[PDB]
Amino acid sequence: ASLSLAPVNIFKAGADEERAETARLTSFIGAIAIGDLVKSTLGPKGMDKILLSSGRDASLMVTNDGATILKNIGVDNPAAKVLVDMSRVQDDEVGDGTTSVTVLAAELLREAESLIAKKIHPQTIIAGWREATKAAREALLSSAVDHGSDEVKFRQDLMNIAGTTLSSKLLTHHKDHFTKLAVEAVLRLKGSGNLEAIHIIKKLGGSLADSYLDEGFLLDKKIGVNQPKRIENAKILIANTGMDTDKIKIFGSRVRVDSTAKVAEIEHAEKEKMKEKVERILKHGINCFINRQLIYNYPEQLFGAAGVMAIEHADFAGVERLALVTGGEIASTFDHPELVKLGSCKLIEEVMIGEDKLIHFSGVALGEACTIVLRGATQQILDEAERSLHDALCVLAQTVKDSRTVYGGGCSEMLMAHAVTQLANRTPGKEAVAMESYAKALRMLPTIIADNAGYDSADLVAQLRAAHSEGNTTAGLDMREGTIGDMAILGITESFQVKRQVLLSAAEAAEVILRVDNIIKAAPRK
Amino acid sequence: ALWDVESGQLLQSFVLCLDLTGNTFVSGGAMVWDMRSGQCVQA
Amino acid sequence: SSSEDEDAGEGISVNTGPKGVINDWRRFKQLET
Ligand SMILES: Nc1ncnc2c1ncn2[C@@H]1O[C@H](COP(=O)(O)OP(=O)(O)O)[C@@H](O)[C@H]1O
Numbered sequence: 229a230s231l232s233l234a235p236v237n238i239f240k241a242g243a244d245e246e247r248a249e250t251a252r253l254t255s256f257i258g259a260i261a262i263g264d265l266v267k268s269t270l271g272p273k274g275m276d277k278i279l280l281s282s283g284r285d286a287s288l289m290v291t292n293d294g295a296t297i298l299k300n301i302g303v304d305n306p307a308a309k310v311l312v313d314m315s316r317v318q319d320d321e322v323g324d325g326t327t328s329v330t331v332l333a334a335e336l337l338r339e340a341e342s343l344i345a346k347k348i349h350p351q352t353i354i355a356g357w358r359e360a361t362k363a364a365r366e367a368l369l370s371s372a373v374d375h376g377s378d379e380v381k382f383r384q385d386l387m388n389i390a391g392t393t394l395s396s397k398l399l400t401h402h403k404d405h406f407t408k409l410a411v412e413a414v415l416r417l418k419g420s421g422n423l424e425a426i427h428i429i430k431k432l433g434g435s436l437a438d439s440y441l442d443e444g445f446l447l448d449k450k451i452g453v454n455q456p457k458r459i460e461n462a463k464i465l466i467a468n469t470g471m472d473t474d475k476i477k478i479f480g481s482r483v484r485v486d487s488t489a490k491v492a493e494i495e496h497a498e499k500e501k502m503k504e505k506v507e508r509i510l511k512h513g514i515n516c517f518i519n520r521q522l523i524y525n526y527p528e529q530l531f532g533a534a535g536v537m538a539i540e541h542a543d544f545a546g547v548e549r550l551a552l553v554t555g556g557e558i559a560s561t562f563d564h565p566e567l568v569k570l571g572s573c574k575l576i577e578e579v580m581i582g583e584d585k586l587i588h589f590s591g592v593a594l595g596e597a598c599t600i601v602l603r604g605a606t607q608q609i610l611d612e613a614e615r616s617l618h619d620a621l622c623v624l625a626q627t628v629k630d631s632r633t634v635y636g637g638g639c640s641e642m643l644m645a646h647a648v649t650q651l652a653n654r655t656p657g658k659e660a661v662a663m664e665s666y667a668k669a670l671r672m673l674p675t676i677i678a679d680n681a682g683y684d685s686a687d688l689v690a691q692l693r694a695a696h697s698e699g700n701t702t703a704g705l706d707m708r709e710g711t712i713g714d715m716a717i718l719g720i721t722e723s724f725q726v727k728r729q730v731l732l733s734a735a736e737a738a739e740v741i742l743r744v745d746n747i748i749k750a751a752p753r754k
Numbered sequence: 755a756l757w758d759v760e761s762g763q764l765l766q767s768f769v770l771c772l773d774l775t776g777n778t779f780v781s782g783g784a785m786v787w788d789m790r791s792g793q794c795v796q797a
Numbered sequence: 798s799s800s801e802d803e804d805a806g807e808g809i810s811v812n813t814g815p816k817g818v819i820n821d822w823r824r825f826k827q828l829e830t
């Protein structure tokens with residue numbers, strides 16, 4: 229007898245449970261709903277979605293990113309929660325692939341539902357899927373191509389990867405310009421994976437084509453009152469000192485005198501201490517001074533008297549980026565000027581972007597830190613462009629880390645599914661049926677890609693399957709006019725890491741959800 | 755958020771109640787933050 | 798001077814649950830009737 233369907237009641241008020249039919253049905257409906265929601269935003273012809281917040285602020289967000297869509301939705305279905313967390317983890321691990329992994333998991337779970345309807349034990353499906361995943365992973369690894377040795381071919385691969393990543397976003401309008409921008413920004417990192425070193429500034433107004441990658445650096449801070457507004461051949465000193473009534477850190481100390489003259493003497497001593505601090509700072513022979521914390525009126529007056537630029541309140545990210553771009557050292561003590569390296573740049577000036585004024589560093593020494601100015605017509609456009617640029621930069625950094633690349637446009641899915649089908653053709657039992665369903669989902673991915681463009685998806689997928697079975701391992705969807713073509717010639721390439729992560733995460737989450745045969749819910753707080 | 759009284763500027767933005775050396779403070783919804791590093795240090 | 802102006806699955810067809818809960822249903826139904 230079931231727990232809920234028994235004469236005696238064993239549950240608190242509001243707590244229930246769902247047995248075989250109900251649990252599997254709930255899981256499958258949740259997964260299919262999530263997959264159908266996230267899809268239609270997939271491929272070069274995917275469309276965007278509007279996310280209306282129900283809160284008091286009522287935030288507006290139009291986006292194409294699958295993870296962003298899945299994060300900002302009220303989800304109560306536990307399997308849907310599993311898929312949402314899968315997409316979030318995929319976004320954390322790599323840039324793109326958030327929609328692909330979700331759609332693949334949903335298709336796998338649809339095939340699992342169909343198989344369960346055919347009286348096949350879910351554990352058999354899991355074993356068949358494990359074997360299929362092994363075969364597909366081996367095929368994808370064998371199909372990978374590496375061009376990290378040759379610089380020109382690696383740069384071409386980076387351009388192709390950035391273009392493929394941006395083809396599905398709102399940036400596809402200026403894909404060429406934005407791809408060049410992203411590739412330059414990533415290459416300026418000098419091999420570092422620090423994506424925080426790339427700062428994206430969104431300024432309203434102007435055109436999307438007006439966006440650019442600054443040759444130097446841009447800071448959104450302000451200069452002091454009497455400080456110079458323009459420095460040539462600047463010598464930078466990046467600091468993280470107090471400089472705001474810098475109190476001696478003996479917090480048990482107090483001034484305990486018997487006259488106001490002594491109090492005046494002590495405050496003069498404090499001012500003299502601050503002046504000596506500024507003098508020690510100036511002993512380094514500097515023209516500009518960026519401090520992470522605030523700079524009060526007396527130190528900035530001293531700096532203006534010394535005629536050196538003093539930028540204040542540049543947060544931890546700001547000072548880190550300035551150190552990366554100018555080569556300086558973030559110093560908190562100034563007793564050994566010879567042991568502190570000073571940042572350098574050719575010119576510092578104030579630039580006028582939109583209606584706001586920003587500090588511009590030109591002719592930087594190192595340059596291993598980028599600032600990207602994004603211009604748009606709406607705040608929604610700026611946010612979506614920032615998200616798309618983040619995707620492109622993430623994928624480019626991953627490719628820099630691991631230079632192995634695979635061919636997109638459904639070619640990788642087609643070859644993996646062909647390997648899965650070949651394995652299934654020599655396997656007895658219902659495991660072969662499970663393998664065939666796995667290959668069916670792998671086919672269904674480029675099928676959805678073709679459907680989103682309005683092409684004849686069935687015929688195109690049949691042509692791709694025939695071409696891959698024949699031996700044309702580089703065949704893929706040509707989305708320019710709706711035919712099939714050589715992905716190597718067309719330059720539709722992807723990161724091997726992204727595709728492998730999509731495959732493995734989708735298979736893992738499908739296996740996790742398929743194992744559930746009972747969903748027990750506790751009584752909610754409300 | 756913590757603000758500088760004299761300069762009237764937002765030092766750093768990070769909570770039904772919170773309590774505090776004016777460098778380490780704990781916020782409850784524990785979440786201990788250090789102003790020297792601007793990161794959560796205890797939980 | 799000083800002197801101035803200042804001054805899916807919708808079809809459920811629930812099967813046995815109604816049988817299990819008919820006791821409470823009739824418990825409320827008698828008072829409601
Ligand atoms: N120019 C192109 N030609 C053919 N296929 C493409 C092209 N650009 C992207 N795709 C395909 O569209 C799919 C979806 O990519 P996208 O929606 O940008 O991100 P995600 O992989 O997170 O869905 C990818 O698997 C890729 O193979």
Ligand SMILES: [Mg+2]
Nearest residue numbers: 324325393396
């Ligand atoms: Mg993408």
